[PDB]
């Protein structure tokens, strides 16, 4: 569902980019990730570690769906489920959620 991520432990709402990097740098591990709401309308970021570096990917909420690049999904939860199964960046998949404390 459209707002089902609001009770997912990997979703951190208005966590800042710096706060997200701090969390990802505590015990660095390729495949670690969290999702945050950006300070732009209808915009989220996946913050993650892949191939030894920390990166951020923008996700757009467009009407009822979400878009990552050219790929559309029904919802953020569906997007995250897909990228647990198929690579998000190079060969890295979402594997180790950083949970809200």
């Amino acid at each position: 569902g459209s707002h089902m991520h609001e009770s997912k432990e990997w979703y951190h709402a208005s966590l800042t980019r710096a706060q997200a990097e701090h969390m990802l740098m505590r015990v660095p591990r390729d495949g670690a990730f969290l999702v945050r709401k950006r300070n732009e309308p209808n915009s989220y970021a996946i913050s993650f570690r892949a191939e030894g570096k920390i990166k951020h990917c923008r996700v757009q909420q467009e009407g009822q769906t979400v878009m990552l690049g050219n790929s559309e999904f029904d919802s953020l939860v569906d997007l995250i489920s897909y990228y647990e199964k198929h690579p998000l960046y190079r060969k890295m998949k979402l594997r180790y959620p950083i949970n809200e404390e």
Partner: peptide, 8 residues
């Protein structure tokens, strides 16, 4: 100046 993974 936030750097993100390139679009597309």
């Amino acid at each position: 100046s936030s750097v993100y993974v390139p679009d597309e």
